[PDB]
Amino acid sequence: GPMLCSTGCGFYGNPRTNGMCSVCYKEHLQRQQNS
Amino acid sequence: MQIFVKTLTGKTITLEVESSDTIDNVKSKIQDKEGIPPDQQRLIFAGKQLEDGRTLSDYNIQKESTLHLVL
Ligand SMILES: [Zn+2]
Secondary structure, three states, X not given: OOOEOOOOOOOEOOOXXXXXXXXXXXXXXXXXXXX | OEEEEEOOOOXXXXXEOOXXXXXXXXXXXXXXXXXXXXXXXXXXXXXXXXXXXXXHHHOOOOOOOEEEEEO
């Protein structure tokens, strides 16, 4: 249900995404995609 | 998708939005219907005050969701 951000930023996270909000999703995807 | 914004008068605002819409963008849409200045709106959803630089997706506001407005 309340899929709160894994990083513990205090905001909600989209269950369709990787369990993270729109802000952390791109920030982490850049390092995961590059690596 | 449409969402509803209940005011404390009892009236309900219906908005046509996207999940990708910023909160600031929503408040501008409110100004477009009501004439209320965006910098005087405090939007609530799920017991949280909405942050201007965040988006609807950042709170999981989906279709048929109802928010509250404090003046
Ligand atoms: Zn986050």
